[PDB]
Design a protein around this ligand. Structure first.
Ligand SMILES: O=C(O)[C@H]1NCCS1
Ligand SMILES: O=C(O)[C@H]1NCCS1
Lengths: 281, 274, 266, 281, 266
């Protein structure tokens, strides 16, 4: 609905997240690759080589990225953000929307640094995940103190092109990190294990990987397109005395559900802990 | 071409819905028979354009490809009921759990000598055209029958041919798989709720995370452990979470599940015949 | 019609039936602790199993499973055509009863039933299976009679072992859970009497919500738990101990033991 | 028996507890639905459209609910209760009875906020549960400093129409929260798992759900109508060598009793924690 | 002499004392379920705690631990020099009682006691510690009185928390064990009533053997177990579940909770 074929996007950081978003945005056709600039500390990653081939402009100077861009994604380690903010703070102009993707880093900490330079920085905090690279990401965002109303709409329009996107209150983002931020790693672990189980029972490894991934994708899509509770879908597919209900019993006996709860909790708690350590420093 | 379902349970409904959404045949070319069809399935199928009848004989006479989608122990009764009505044109596709090509051909061969039988292992996500299917061809299935099966089931998801002796393992992996995923998504959502998310949002994010990760793996040549390595930054939230999964033996539980489902399927393969 | 009993479940059904007003207490004859209460109700008592048979139309057998063959050998000559013989003994099959009774008269009308103790407060759960010679109207009569003291439905006989593991043993799972929940309340500072009352009321209310809802139990669970709240914290510690798997283990163990009793008999 | 057919009831919050109480009250016939008003920050909730169909008046303004009501239920999240009190404190009148249903929120905290506006607020604290929707709830309440003796009796009459209700000392309410407040969720978990066990052993899912729920309902009623210890009732069910005592052994081997003790403790401890975190702010 | 009570342990001691014949039931005054039984015995009842103080020489305080300060504030002005105040409240220290009572009269005679419910069958286990102002003859009088309903010995006050974890909570460990042993008997085919009787008789006999033996409990254990036999097989499964460690955990948990109550008070 918004015309942003003239919009320039910059990434500070040229790692996994910058590649994933840039590949997703250009695959969606919402951004031309030549309108994307990325800056990296080391021009020796495979990520910067793939970005170069996409047509993304690459530079070693964070200041160049700032001057080129309208929307500026900060995709660096959480503990690097306060060094980037001190570096680029004077170059932030009124046109800029600063989008922080660093886990744990609060809007208040970013606005505090940038406000020392120019008084009303437009800041958005987001938590996205690597599946944006195949345009099936899960993203949430929260708008900062000086973010205008169209800033949030622009950001939802941009991130919706590469997956699910919705606005949340900032105090939910650490929990989202433990669920959909870390979620793909839980799935990769599960898929590796499911493939081992297929191999134990006689399947070739390549087929077992394909079938397990297709099973997970189809089940996830079923749930997304259904109004039904996941327990109801579980109920619908477990015939009496059959193979599936026998397998569900052995999952329950090992406390499978509790492990996944433990995981979301552990990732969320670590996210809160990393930020608390940063605020102390 | 006409398709029939003997059975109107969840799997027959999912295949009929997926086939119609695929447009590979008009729904008026689909017929389903059940002696006990619930009003919800009858209403949805009828609003779908699928013909309905209580007489399995009418389904057989209507159909070219005949899906047997009933509980395993019901199969011998169906075959004795319809066996005399099986013509040379029919391809009989069995979806019943653990029912062997041998037990079907032995029954049908008493009526007419060369029944064309295919054994199928599919799953419920065919309803959103993202199923995972394998099939094995019987003694008298012509080479064109397997090709026709593969084209048909490819319209509602992944499909490939296997030897019949792998179908029990596939059952434990992609047949039961969606249930493992529904269990995991329920627990992941509980985790999100424990950490402060509304249930509705937690369910959506967990399912989107699973869908995206599975698509990444399907569209990548890299090992799932490599994709996991790419997600986990040093000292970060994800590697902390992976450790608590490892401490509970998460991987072993999923191996246990595939094995338990496969072994139960073999028990159904046996106790059928003995 | 007249009803006869040949125990704990014997008293429960007579108490429930009379409270239901479906049968007058004197049209009921029975054949200890439980025998003192029945006399108060007006239930006729007799030590001779043969007297209960002669005055009854519907005949409940509520004795231990390895005691049925001896009762059938004693009463078998007295079973007339008017009799419906209803066996409540766990694990005793219709086949075993019919085999014994058929030595006397060729077409015994046998029904096998699986009920539970809450019939004494008219909230039982009962299933029944009809035998070879039971008329269609016999199953309907049994459903009407046992519907007066709880839920009742017909099943195939091969499901009764599973029903036994679920609603037959079910009340004992609940009594164990209620004792433990009350201990938890006491640990956190509640008086024992209030803890028992609150825990039982919570279980009763939740069970009634589910029976009166179309929704899945997980959906009702989701409605209790506010984000970050007390309930979701408690649910996590249940999951960490494999709570669900323990209840699956229980239903399985009771079902499998019932099958062993269905076999040891033969 | 106090006369209150013509009194007005308000809910601050239109969530699950407001729906359950409103449904129970109207099904009991003790309140007409048009005498009920509820306010919610979000109107797209399923619970809000259901309240509309019942005839309950819905408003986005908490002030209108106060001015409409005689008895005011606070049925919102615990951590926001302090913002509500600041928002409607000036609109509390001498006629009002404020009934807080929030877990952990103490009478003293409510009275301290409301006393800033008008000196003797009438406050009652209660802990109820969702089965009030089928008129089988379990409710306890404690009366505040300025609650008249008739306010407690009115409270007990009203909540007795939808379940068990009794007065307690306030220092028991956190323990009640872990037992009958969270209790229904323990039962729903148990019923799901019991049905799974029935399905594993060959029952259709719908029958297994019905049988399991009826077993638990009947057992609970037996205990409520018996003077006997639950261990004695357990002994009456368990014939020697039989199916039930075999199942009880596998429950004991998994520490089933300890898990339920752990749950009550965990819910109670979290309830105390929430209030302690609130008082820190 | 006259004795006064200010509950469950209140009834147990009055029942034991009267069965012992050490005190006439009418020389005992007390201040519900338990109050209906005491009236049958002849135990004088009164709602006013001040009346029990005025008619008593030895004064037992059998109320909840956080209730003692309120009782001492009420009766403190009525404590005369003739009084021995015996506190049975778990975790209430001699220091806390003396502090309260010393505000009224300077030298209150206080004894702290740790007893258990089996005093009701005159097989209790009691220890006591004497306070700052208790005369030597007060401890001797208390030992004589409480020896009439079980074992009794003097300890230092700093051992009473540990005693609480062992013989104070001990009977509940035994009731749990007896319930479980009976369930085991029922699982193997015994009727419940016989199983409870046999299990309790086994525990009583073993306990008496140990009390009347000079030998170590392990030596007595060795005498039960024949080589390759049933008992040594059962002992192995106890060891495999860490049975011993569970009982150590219990004594520790009860002792530590008692210390928390000894502190939360202050
Ligand atoms: O916040 C919650 O989890 C509430 N659930 C019922 C008791 S408190
Ligand atoms: O042989 C043994 O272990 C004997 N011990 C007492 C019961 S049998």
């Amino acid at each position: 609905n918004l015309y942003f074929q003239s919009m320039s996007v910059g990434f500070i950081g040229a790692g996994q997240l910058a590649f994933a978003l840039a590949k997703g945005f250009t695959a969606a056709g919402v951004l031309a690759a030549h309108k994307i600039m990325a800056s990296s500390p080391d021009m020796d990653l495979a990520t910067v080589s793939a970005l170069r081939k996409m047509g993304v402009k690459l530079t070693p100077h964070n200041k160049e990225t700032v001057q080129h861009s309208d929307v500026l994604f900060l995709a660096v380690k959480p503990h690097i953000i306060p060094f980037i903010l001190d570096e680029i703070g004077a170059d932030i102009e009124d046109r800029h929307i600063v989008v922080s993707c660093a886990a744990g880093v609060t809007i208040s900490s970013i606005e505090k640094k940038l406000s020392a330079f120019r008084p009303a920085p437009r800041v958005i905090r987001c938590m996205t995940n690597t599946p944006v690279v195949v345009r099936e990401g899960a993203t949430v965002y929260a708008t900062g103190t000086h973010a205008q109303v169209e800033d949030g709409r622009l950001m939802e329009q941009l991130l919706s092109s590469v997956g699910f996107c919705t606005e949340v209150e900032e105090d939910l983002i650490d929990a989202v990190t433990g669920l959909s931020g870390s979620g793909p790693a839980y799935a990769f672990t599960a898929l590796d294990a499911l493939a081992d189980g297929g191999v134990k029972m006689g399947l070739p490894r390549r087929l077992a990987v394909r079938l397990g991934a297709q099973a997970l994708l189809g089940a996830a899509k079923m749930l997304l397109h259904s109004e039904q509770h996941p327990g109801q879908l579980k109920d619908n597919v477990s015939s009496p005395g059959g193979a599936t209900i026998h397998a569900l019993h052995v999952l329950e006996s090992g406390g499978f559900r509790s492990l996944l709860i433990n995981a979301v909790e552990a990732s969320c708690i670590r996210t809160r802990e990393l930020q608390s350590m940063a605020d102390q420093e």
